[PDB]
UniProtKB/Swiss-Prot annotation:
One biological process term in Gene Ontology: protein targeting to ER
GO molecular function, one term: 7S RNA binding
Function: Component of the signal recognition particle (SRP) complex, a ribonucleoprotein complex that mediates the cotranslational targeting of secretory and membrane proteins to the endoplasmic reticulum (ER).
GO cellular component: nucleolus; nucleus; signal recognition particle, endoplasmic reticulum targeting
Family membership: Belongs to the SRP14 family.
Transmembrane segments: none
Record key words, sorted: Cytoplasm, Ribonucleoprotein, RNA-binding, Signal recognition particle
Designated name of the protein: Signal recognition particle subunit srp14
Cytoplasm among keywords: yes
Amino acid sequence: MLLSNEEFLKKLTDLLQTHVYLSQKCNPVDEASVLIRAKSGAAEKISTVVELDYFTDFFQSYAEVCKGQIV
């Protein structure tokens, strides 16, 4: 189900921990903000809605989980 940003990043970690790939879809939502979907290999999909005002912050945290899992 639709997760909060902080939970999406938490579950993203644990998707990459249990893994290579990451695929992501983004569609815009009408209240203006964006729906992000992520899926890694065998795992289910995960979802969150990121508000325009929180884009910088969210993508800054998103980078963290990404580069954190690589090392």
